[PDB]
C-alpha cells in the first residue's frame, strides 16, 4: 500500500532524446505502487489518483575514457518543464558528477510524466551514465 | 681574365702569378675561374654524410635515421614526426580538427564517416585517432 | 487536505535582503494547505499546527548579461539558519546554476520562517533568480 | 508518533572510516521516533519495521586553513552501496561545500544502516565537515 | 674658424679648401659652421610629411589617419586608442577601476553615482561603458 | 726575458725601454714579468670591499648584509633564502616535497614523522613549516 514509485534508467549512453526506464518492481531500486503505471510505448509515468506528489530525480555520471570529454548534461521533466537540472561534467581531476532536484507537483488524474536528456558535450562518448543511479521518484503527500 | 682558364677542382692563386694551383684540402670549385676553393661542408652530429666532397663537388648532408631534412639542403633536422602529426613544409604540424593520423611518419586523412556505412559513432576520434564505428 | 505548502519567489534582481513569496494556490508551483499561512508584511511562512517537516529549498540563477558576472549567492532559512545553501556562479562556459537542500525539521506552533538571500558577487547585475524556480517547500511527517 | 529520523554526524576531522552521529533527540537537529534506534558500538542506524523510505543525506564542508586544501570528499551509505555523494572542495575563492542525494529505498525488518566518509584530498586538515550540517535522514512512505 | 662664415643651407666643405658649398640634394644645415649637411628626415608608411625638408631646416613628420604620435619628435605610430581605454604619454592605457571611456580617441571618466540623482543601479560599468542607472 | 727581472708590483714598461716602472694607480701584478698592470676590481653597489687593493694583490668582494656570494669569486649577490628555500651553489631553491625550512638563511630538513613518538598529524607541513602532531 501508499501512493509512490521509483523508475530506475536504462540508458547509458549520452544520447540526445527521452530517456527509458525500468518499472519492474523485481528490479534493485525500482518502486511501483497501485494507482502508478509506466507506459512501455511512449517511456511516460502514468498517476492515475489527482493529487499533490513530491516529485524528484537524480542524475549520476561517470568518466568512461581517461583524459577526455567535457561539458554538461541536463535532465528535464515534461508533463515548459516541470523539473530541470544541469550537471557540469568536469575536464580531466575526478571522475563522477552528481545532481539532485526536488518539488512539490500537482498531478492532474491520468498525467503522464516524461523525462528528456540534452548533452552540451564535447567528446560525448567520454562520459555515460551511471547504471543505477539515474532515478525518477515520486510519493503522495495528499490523504 | 687569364684566371678563366683555371678549371673546376683548381683557383687561379694570386699568390702564385695567376696560375691554377689544384684546390687545397678540404675545399672545392665547381666552376673554373674562381679565386679561391670553397671549403668543404661537414655533415656531423645528427647530420650525416649523403655524398663525399670532391675537389669538384661540395659534400651534401642527410639526416641520421629518425630525424627528416627541413628547409634548402638539408639545413635543419627534425625529429620524424609521430602520431596526431604531419610533415608539412615548416615542419611536424599537428592536424586540424575532424582529421586524424595513427602512425609515425603518416599523413592526416579526415575521419571516417561512419554513416556512410550505416553505422554509428562508438568513440569520437582525435588528431591521433579515428572515430570507432560500431553496428 | 494535508499539511504542505510550496512558495515560489517573486525576487528577480541579486540584492541583499529577505526574499518576497507568491503564496496564492491559483500559480503555478504554489501550494498552500489549511495550517500554512503566508504574512506578505514580515515575509514569513507562519506555521500554525507544531510537528517535524520536510523542509526544502531550491536556488536557479541563469546568466542575463553575457560574459560578465563571478562569484557565489547563498539562501538561509531563519526561524543561527536552521537551513543553508551557497550556489557557485561560474565565469563565462555555461548559462545556469542550480542548488537543492532539504531537512527533517521541528516547528513550534506559530512558528515563523523567512528566507534571505546574499550575494558575494563581482557583477551582480549579470546575473539573476530564475523565475518559478526559486521555491520554498515543506510537508509535514509526523501524523 | 510516525516513522521517522534524522542524525547529525559527530565527526569533524576528515578520516576515512565509518561516521559517529548523534541520536538524543535532545539535542538540535536530532529526531528519533520508535521503530528507529542508532547502535553506539557499529555506528549504525536499525531499521526495526520493513517498508519504503525516503533516505537522504547531506554533507557540509567548510575550509579551516587560508589559502589550503583540494580535492573531494565521499559519503556512502551501505545495508554496493544503497546512497552515494561525492563533493568537490575548491582551492583557495569561496570556504564551503555542499551536497545533497535523496532516494526511495525499500529496507528490511532489522536493516542496519551505516555511512562511511572517504577522502580523495590533498592538505585534509585544511577541511572539516561543518558541525551540524552533516545529516543522515529517513522518514517512511508505505503505510 | 673660416669655416663660421659658412651660412645655414650650406657646409664648410674640407675637399674643396674649405669654401662654403650648397648642401648636396635631401640633406639640410639649420645653423652655420658644419663641415657636413645633415640627411633630411624621410616619412614613410606609416608616417605622412607634415612639413618638407628644406637646405636649411629638416622635414618633420606626424602620423597617417587613424593613428597619432608617440615620443621625442614623432618617433613612433600608435593606432588610435578605442572603448576602454585612453592615450597617454606611454600609448594607449586601460581605464583604471571605476572609470570608464565609450569612445574612440576618449578619455576616461569616472562612473556615473547613480545615487546622486536619486537612482539605483541597473547595471554596473566597466571600462568601456558608464553605469546604467534605473528610476 | 729583461722584462722577467720585473717584480711584482711592477711592470716591464715598452714605452721606456723595458724598465720595472711601478704599478699605476688603481692597479697591480700579483706576479713578475707582465708587460702591465691588471686593474683593480671595485667592489660597489651590492658589492663591499672584503680586501684592498694593493700594488700586488686584487680587491675581492664580498656582499652587503642581507645578501651572499654566488659563483666564481663572488661574481653575483643574491638576497639571503626565506622560509620554504634553501641555499645552493646556484642559488635559492625550493625544499623538495617532504622537506620543510622554517628559518632565514635555514636549511631544508625532512617533516617530523609525528607516528614514530606515538602522535597523529594534525597539520600537515608545507616546504615552509613542520608538521603538527598531536596526542
Same mark, same amino acid.
Given at each position: ?69 567535457? $561539458?554538461?548534461?541536463?535532465?528535464? !521533466? @515534461? #508533463?515548459? *518543464?516541470?523539473?530541470? /537540472?544541469? &550537471?557540469? %561534467?568536469?575536464?580531466? +581531476? =575526478?571522475?563522477?558528477?552528481? $545532481?539532485?532536484?526536488?518539488?512539490? !507537483? @500537482? #498531478?492532474? *488524474?491520468?498525467?503522464? /510524466?516524461? &523525462?528528456? %536528456?540534452?548533452?552540451? +558535450? =564535447? ?21 | ?135
Amino acid at each position: 500500500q501508499g501512493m509512490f514509485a521509483q523508475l530506475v534508467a536504462q540508458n547509458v549512453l549520452l544520447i540526445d532524446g527521452p530517456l527509458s526506464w525500468y518499472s519492474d518492481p523485481g528490479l534493485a531500486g525500482v518502486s511501483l505502487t497501485g494507482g502508478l503505471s509506466y507506459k512501455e510505448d511512449t517511456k511516460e509515468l502514468v498517476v492515475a489518483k489527482a493529487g499533490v506528489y513530491y516529485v524528484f530525480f537524480q542524475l549520476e555520471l561517470r568518466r568512461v575514457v581517461a583524459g577526455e570529454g567535457s $561539458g554538461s548534461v541536463s535532465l528535464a !521533466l @515534461h #508533463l515548459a *518543464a516541470a523539473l530541470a /537540472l544541469t &550537471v557540469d %561534467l568536469p575536464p580531466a +581531476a =575526478r571522475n563522477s558528477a552528481f $545532481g539532485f532536484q526536488g518539488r512539490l !507537483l @500537482h #498531478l492532474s *488524474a491520468g498525467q503522464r /510524466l516524461g &523525462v528528456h %536528456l540534452h548533452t552540451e +558535450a =564535447r567528446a560525448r562518448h567520454a562520459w555515460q551514465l551511471t547504471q543505477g543511479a539515474t532515478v525518477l521518484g515520486l510519493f503522495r503527500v495528499t490523504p | 681574365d687569364p684566371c678563366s682558364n683555371c678549371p673546376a677542382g683548381t683557383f687561379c692563386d694570386n699568390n702564385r702569378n695567376q696560375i691554377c694551383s689544384p684546390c687545397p684540402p678540404n675545399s672545392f670549385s665547381s666552376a673554373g675561374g674562381q679565386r679561391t676553393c670553397d671549403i668543404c661542408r661537414q655533415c656531423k652530429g645528427v647530420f650525416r654524410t649523403r655524398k663525399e666532397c670532391s675537389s669538384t663537388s661540395n659534400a651534401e648532408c642527410d639526416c641520421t635515421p629518425g630525424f627528416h631534412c627541413l628547409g634548402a639542403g638539408c639545413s635543419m633536422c627534425e625529429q620524424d614526426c609521430k602520431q596526431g602529426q604531419e610533415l608539412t613544409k615548416k615542419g611536424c604540424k599537428d592536424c586540424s580538427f575532424g582529421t586524424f593520423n595513427d602512425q609515425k611518419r603518416g599523413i592526416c586523412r579526415p575521419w571516417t564517416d561512419c554513416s556512410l556505412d550505416g553505422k554509428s559513432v562508438l568513440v569520437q576520434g582525435t588528431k591521433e585517432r579515428d572515430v570507432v564505428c560500431g553496428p
